[PDB]
Scaffold this active site. Structure first.
Site, PDB file in Angstrom:
ATOM      1  N   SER A 106       0.775  -1.314   0.074  1.00 44.13           N
ATOM      2  CA  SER A 106      -0.093   0.104  -0.031  1.00 44.13           C
ATOM      3  C   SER A 106       0.793   1.406   0.015  1.00 44.13           C
ATOM      4  CB  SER A 106      -0.917   0.036   1.147  1.00 44.13           C
ATOM      5  OG  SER A 106      -0.218   0.454   2.566  1.00 44.13           O
ATOM      6  N   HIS A 245     -11.535  -6.446   3.645  1.00 43.43           N
ATOM      7  CA  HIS A 245     -10.384  -5.714   4.093  1.00 43.43           C
ATOM      8  C   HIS A 245      -9.295  -6.778   5.068  1.00 43.43           C
ATOM      9  CE1 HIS A 245      -9.801  -1.302   4.437  1.00 43.43           C
ATOM     10  NE2 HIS A 245      -8.611  -1.718   4.931  1.00 43.43           N
TER      11      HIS A 245
END
Ligand code: FMN
Lengths: 350, 352
Positions: A106, A245
């Site tokens: 990320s 998630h």
């Protein structure tokens, strides 16, 4: 002694880093609901080994979008861990070769896009988000490339964040000597700016609308219901992986499992199918891997071992699954994913 | 039967491209005074041989920024050269790659940084073009990440961009089909061709120069200098390499010729960092000179485009072997065995 049990890192952790801080890594936003079945549904579904399999040559190592990786136990978009490290995150880099596979991260994953990979000739998978405009998004096109940061994947699930008041219930901010080292030098500062991307641009109107924008692939993540997912196929990007998630975003979301063939059926082949559920013992990853998989998705798992064992740390993990699951593979015989099947896995639900 | 003159091309590839195209590549600011003062400039530097020496071997071989660019001639970031043969940018990286040097591309590119790099293994730089809001910049800068663009040619001479006549009479139609795939289309969130003609920051400064640094390393060059007040200023503000230039004489006219303005720019920043002037240069005869003044290596512009547009990957591939195969006369005949023995010790120059 020695590292045997996967969750052997689970005790150690308690006494290896700050709570406030670790509250960002493994932490289930909402009712602790989805992290349970995530370590319990395949712990639910069984397998009945195939008998007397002669062996010489085995495919653990396999051809995916080209390459023949030993263990495609690829990761998943990660985030915020430099306060969980000394010498860097080139660990999960030197790993995607040692324990080679798909490295995915990320922008919160506070590492320098070029720096982490300072150890090898492999490809790469970027964390996206439909950032609150296009000066925020769009530009992801303008980074994760073929001859470099290989394939893309737009997060088709998130436009706000799952509220697990662990770290939320206390004094957290972030390590001074850091920011979101990926997003850093921006239209910033690098304090609040980056969060201001939270907006519900939940449409394909800005999805295939982007394919004519990027030349790079797009394993659009988050597809837990073929019931809009057929549409996440009727309209979309690539290798479309169901993902909550990582057992959260809305703890009560079913584990990323059930959507397995429910989406592999409302998409099939096309622009691929996957699942993001927790799979610690090198069997759990195997389960879904038969019933609906191609690689072996992760991210945070290596986060104990990313947090306490360096480059290697994570490498071994995937081996905790490449050794593990290959044991399984060759154990009940099967030497490739085509000979791999459903009625051999003793799944409760069919 | 084969024809050699490194610009004999200009005129052939002139008849190959639609008015707009040729004029987009063949312009200069308003009166274009410095256009010919970009060539008839090096003619004011008289040679100065030394003789009766060993020339069996020579040495173009470089190392600019810790990079052995095979030979000392490089490529300068021309805008859409895919208009001038739909491939351009793409086949220039591969061309240079086979040629062992750098293929420098701008943000105004037809092929994106995602797109070109598929060409494979070889050294290349990319011109930064800072814009109004730096969120899209910030991500473009970090696009040429561990893909490898090594440095960033930050163009300090292009806030409000030069008034090249031509364009605005034969109103430059940015070819409907053909796109600037380097941004291709961005927007905040609520277009192409005039997105790019819809973004930039006219207040780019040595304070922004500051920021850029905490968003990268990639050796930040200074593109657009012709004076020593922004040269010593350039070492004063952490960097290496300079790209002394006029902008193909496209931004501002009557501003000295890269070669002519050079002595003061090199002589200013001494031994701190090396300088590379990208302008005027169309033969190794004149290439030599720049290297004599103190500019360790040099880039190339127009000459590189009137070649792809002319004849594919062979076009530029002579623009480089003709060029390279012209620095092995020049170095040889002046008594030199390699760059080491060049310098402006070895010559004479009109003004002086
Ligand atoms: C068509 C065209 C577009 C240009 N655009 C850029 C640009 O985007 N930014 C920049 O710094 N240089 C640009 N350049 C100039 C070069 O990068 C380089 O300085 C110049 O072309 C060298 O001059 P020469 O053509 O005499 O070799 C442009 C030049 C041309 C021909």
């Amino acid at each position: 002694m020695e590292i045997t049990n996967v969750n052997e890192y689970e005790a150690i952790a308690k006494q290896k880093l700050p709570k406030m801080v670790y509250d960002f890594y493994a932490s289930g936003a909402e009712d602790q609901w989805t992290l349970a079945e995530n370590r319990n549904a395949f712990s639910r579904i069984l397998f009945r080994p195939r008998i007397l399999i002669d062996v010489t040559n085995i495919d653990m190592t396999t051809t995916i979008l080209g390459f023949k990786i030993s263990m495609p136990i690829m990761i998943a978009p990660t985030a915020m861990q430099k306060m969980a490290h000394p010498e860097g995150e080139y660990a999960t880099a030197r790993a995607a070769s040692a324990a080679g596979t798909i490295m995915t991260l990320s922008s919160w994953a506070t590492s320098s896009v070029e720096e982490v990979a300072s150890t090898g000739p492999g490809i790469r998978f970027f964390q996206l988000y439909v950032y609150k405009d296009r000066n925020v998004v769009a530009q992801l096109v303008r980074r994760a490339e073929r001859a470099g940061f290989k394939a893309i994947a737009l997060t088709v699930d998130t436009p706000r964040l799952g509220r697990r008041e662990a770290d939320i219930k206390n004094r957290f901010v972030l390590p001074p000597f850091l920011t979101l080292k990926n997003f850093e030098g921006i239209d910033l500062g690098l304090s609040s700016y980056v969060a201001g991307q939270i907006d519900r641009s939940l449409s394909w109107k800005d999805v295939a609308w982007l394919q004519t924008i990027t030349s790079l692939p797009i394993l659009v993540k988050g597809v837990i219901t073929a019931e809009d997912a057929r549409l996440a196929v009727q309209h979309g990007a690539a290798g479309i992986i169901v993902s909550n998630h990582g057992a959260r975003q809305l703890d009560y979301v079913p584990a990323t499992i059930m959507a397995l063939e429910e989406v592999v059926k409302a998409a099939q082949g096309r622009i691929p199918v996957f699942l993001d559920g927790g799979v610690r013992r090198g069997t759990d990853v195997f389960k879904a891997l038969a019933l609906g998989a191609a690689g072996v998705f992760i991210g945070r798992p290596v986060v104990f071992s990313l947090a306490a064992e360096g480059e290697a740390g994570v490498k071994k993990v995937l081996q905790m699954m490449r050794d593990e699951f290959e044991l399984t593979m060759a154990l009940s015989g099967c030497r490739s994913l085509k000979e791999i099947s459903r009625s051999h896995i003793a799944a409760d639900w069919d």
